[PDB]
Design an enzyme around this catalytic site. Structure first.
Site, PDB file in Angstrom:
ATOM      1  CG  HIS A 162      -1.855  -0.991   1.423  1.00 15.92           C
ATOM      2  ND1 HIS A 162      -1.684  -1.918   2.408  1.00 15.92           N
ATOM      3  CD2 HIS A 162      -3.043  -1.230   0.836  1.00 15.92           C
ATOM      4  CE1 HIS A 162      -2.710  -2.735   2.406  1.00 15.92           C
ATOM      5  NE2 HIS A 162      -3.557  -2.346   1.435  1.00 15.92           N
ATOM      6  CE  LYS A 207     -18.563  -3.854   7.058  1.00 22.13           C
ATOM      7  NZ  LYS A 207     -19.206  -2.632   6.468  1.00 22.13           N
ATOM      8  NE  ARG A 263      -2.176  -8.504  -3.293  1.00 21.28           N
ATOM      9  CZ  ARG A 263      -2.177  -9.831  -3.347  1.00 21.28           C
ATOM     10  NH1 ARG A 263      -1.216 -10.495  -3.960  1.00 21.28           N
ATOM     11  NH2 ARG A 263      -3.152 -10.499  -2.757  1.00 21.28           N
ATOM     12  CB  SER A 268      -4.132  -6.402   4.843  1.00 21.38           C
ATOM     13  OG  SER A 268      -3.624  -5.118   4.508  1.00 21.38           O
TER      14      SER A 268
HETATM   15  O1  LIG Z   1      -6.387  -2.005   2.295  1.00 24.19           O
HETATM   16  C1  LIG Z   1      -6.544  -3.178   1.995  1.00 24.19           C
HETATM   17  O2  LIG Z   1      -5.884  -4.432   2.388  1.00 24.19           O
HETATM   18  C2  LIG Z   1      -6.199  -5.405   1.360  1.00 24.19           C
HETATM   19  C3  LIG Z   1      -4.991  -6.128   0.667  1.00 24.19           C
HETATM   20  O3  LIG Z   1      -5.184  -6.533  -0.695  1.00 24.19           O
HETATM   21  C4  LIG Z   1      -3.775  -5.320   0.525  1.00 24.19           C
HETATM   22  O4  LIG Z   1      -2.886  -6.071  -0.297  1.00 24.19           O
HETATM   23  C5  LIG Z   1      -7.007  -4.558   0.430  1.00 24.19           C
HETATM   24  O5  LIG Z   1      -7.230  -4.856  -0.847  1.00 24.19           O
HETATM   25  C6  LIG Z   1      -7.429  -3.483   1.035  1.00 24.19           C
HETATM   26  O6  LIG Z   1      -8.470  -2.747   0.851  1.00 24.19           O
END
Ligand SMILES: O=C1O[C@H]([C@@H](O)CO)C(O)=C1O
Ligand SMILES: O=C1O[C@H]([C@@H](O)CO)C(O)=C1O
Ligand code: NA
Length: 163
Positions: free
Chosen positions: A19, A43, A92, A130
């Site tokens: 990030h 969540k 990603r 994350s």
């Molecule tokens: O902020 C975040 O954490 C995950 C993760 O993909 C970070 O790689 C994602 O997409 C988010 O919104």
């Protein structure tokens, strides 16, 4: 010819080196970047909004064009409140790509001014998320290589205060 303002929305639970790379790349291309931290009521974030904002500001506050704000509700209502030029997302994997394609078209239908722009990660951050970080930390792995030092310490204080 009007300052550009891009929103970067996420749970940032916690913020990772990936990030950080994305926000730094975006801050070079738009006048303003908003790190928009989705609160996550229905969540269950591991870190509170306050912890997530502090970890983000610790990693990215040296960038003078970056703001840090918590939000909830519809991304398109936040987009309009913020007067954004665009939303920014990192892509990603392929399932990221399909989901983001669908969301961008749904949001454009809710708000014809909506725009989404995507960055791909440098290959040294391409395997970081994350979720995976939370897992390694939970099982007492060392996450130092994937996240800022402030996040490493936050995982110890999450441990110490429980875990
Ligand atoms: O902020 C975040 O954490 C995950 C993760 O993909 C970070 O790689 C994602 O997409 C988010 O919104
Ligand atoms: O001491 C540091 O290392 C982290 C991270 O960048 C490396 O994983 C970070 O923010 C520092 O300032
Ligand atoms: Na990257």
């Amino acid at each position: 010819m009007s300052k550009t303002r891009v929103i970067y929305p996420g749970t940032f639970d916690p913020i990772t080196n990936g990030h950080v790379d994305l926000v730094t790349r975006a801050s070079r291309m738009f006048d303003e970047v908003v790190v928009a931290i989705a609160i996550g009521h229905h969540k269950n974030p591991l870190f509170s909004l306050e912890e997530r904002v502090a970890l983000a500001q610790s990693s990215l506050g040296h960038l003078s064009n970056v703001e840090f704000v918590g939000f909830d509700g519809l991304l398109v209502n936040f987009f309009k409140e913020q007067k954004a030029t665009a939303v920014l997302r990192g892509l990603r994997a392929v399932s990221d790509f399909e989901y983001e394609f669908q969301l961008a078209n749904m949001n454009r239908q809710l708000d014809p001014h909506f725009e989404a722009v995507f960055l791909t990660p440098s290959e040294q951050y391409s395997f970081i998320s994350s979720t995976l970080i939370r897992e390694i930390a939970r099982l007492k792995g060392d996450v130092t290589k994937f996240v800022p030092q402030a996040v490493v310490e936050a995982f110890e204080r999450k441990h110490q205060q429980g875990w």
